[PDB]
Amino acid sequence: NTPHLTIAMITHQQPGDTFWDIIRKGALAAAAKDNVTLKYSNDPDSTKEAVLIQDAVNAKVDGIAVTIPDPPALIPAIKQAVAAGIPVVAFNAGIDQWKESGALMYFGQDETVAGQAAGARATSEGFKHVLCVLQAQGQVQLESRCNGVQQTFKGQYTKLYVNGADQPSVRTTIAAKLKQDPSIDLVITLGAPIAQLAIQAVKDAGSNAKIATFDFNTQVPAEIENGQLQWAIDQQPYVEGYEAVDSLWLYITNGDTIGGGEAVKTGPFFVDKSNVAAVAKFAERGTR
Numbered sequence: 225n226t227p228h229l230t231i232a233m234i235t236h237q238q239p240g241d242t243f244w245d246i247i248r249k250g251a252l253a254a255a256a257k258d259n260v261t262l263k264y265s266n267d268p269d270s271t272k273e274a275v276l277i278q279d280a281v282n283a284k285v286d287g288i289a290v291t292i293p294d295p296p297a298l299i300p301a302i303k304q305a306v307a308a309g310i311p312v313v314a315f316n317a318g319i320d321q322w323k324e325s326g327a328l329m330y331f332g333q334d335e336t337v338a339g340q341a342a343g344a345r346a347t348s349e350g351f352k353h354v355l356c357v358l359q360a361q362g363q364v365q366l367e368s369r370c371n372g373v374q375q376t377f378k379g380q381y382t383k384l385y386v387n388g389a390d391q392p393s394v395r396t397t398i399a400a401k402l403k404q405d406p407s408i409d410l411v412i413t414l415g416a417p418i419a420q421l422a423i424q425a426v427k428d429a430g431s432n433a434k435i436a437t438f439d440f441n442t443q444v445p446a447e448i449e450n451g452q453l454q455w456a457i458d459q460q461p462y463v464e465g466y467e468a469v470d471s472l473w474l475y476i477t478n479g480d481t482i483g484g485g486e487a488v489k490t491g492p493f494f495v496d497k498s499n500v501a502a503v504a505k506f507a508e509r510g511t512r
């Protein structure tokens with residue numbers, strides 16, 4: 225009936241980072257409709273993610289969907305895949321670097337803009353000293369968020385790196401930082417799982433800081449409703465994974481692209497007490 229395609233989706237997912245389950249539900253929903261076999265692979269070591277790109281080039285996949293958190297480490301392998309005639313789409317990380325690579329399209333949110341928006345919003349909500357919590361080092365999409373907050377937040381700014389792989393350590397490290405500096409009045413977490421740890425850290429520390437986050441998980445909607453989280457920034461991972469796949473299907477079958485040489489935006493969008501009801505059920509089933 226229809227042509228059968230094999231698409232490699234290659235990411236930087238740390239094992240156990242549930243954000244990537246929503247990316248994958250989107251990608252499989254596209255793949256189910258487009259007669260695609262989806263090969264999903266990941267490694268949080270960018271040298272190892274490069275090797276995964278090579279594996280898919282050598283396997284002669286029909287397309288590659290790839291994340292670019294560490295451009296120096298990944299661009300050369302992406303260029304190699306393009307020179308081998310395999311179409312590539314970038315998503316989630318690397319919005320500033322995908323076009324140079326020869327990647328055809330990009331799906332995600334402009335993380336500098338989302339950070340700039342979060343800094344201005346935080347200033348408007350009366351906060352004076354923000355702590356931005358980053359769960360990995362050397363990831364452009366995370367650094368952009370924090371740099372953007374620093375640009376627009378009028379008050380004091382502090383960054384804290386935590387090991388996203390060791391949840392109990394994340395919790396104690398955040399609580400310690402809050403106890404040590406009670407002037408911190410807002411913690412912005414860069415993922416929903418880290419948000420959970422921060423909410424608990426604030427209680428542990430006896431701090432008065434509020435918490436805001438990037439992304440949803442199953443717990444975030446309730447947390448916005450009950451005041452545990454000020455707001456969450458939605459980047460629509462389901463859309464990112466879905467479009468990574470479906471866009472390759474449009475290119476391969478009809479030569480089409482989406483975005484005209486610029487990224488296709490999946491966010492940012494701020495969800496707060498005023499609009500959370502529209503998302504909650506979907507977040508609570510893991511598809512937002």
Ligand SMILES: O[C@H]1[C@H](O)[C@@H](O)[C@H](O)[C@@H](O)[C@H]1O
Nearest residue numbers: 241243317365414415438439
């Ligand atoms: O907001 C998410 C979250 O921080 C994930 O942990 C990370 O792997 C993704 O790149 C990012 O888009």
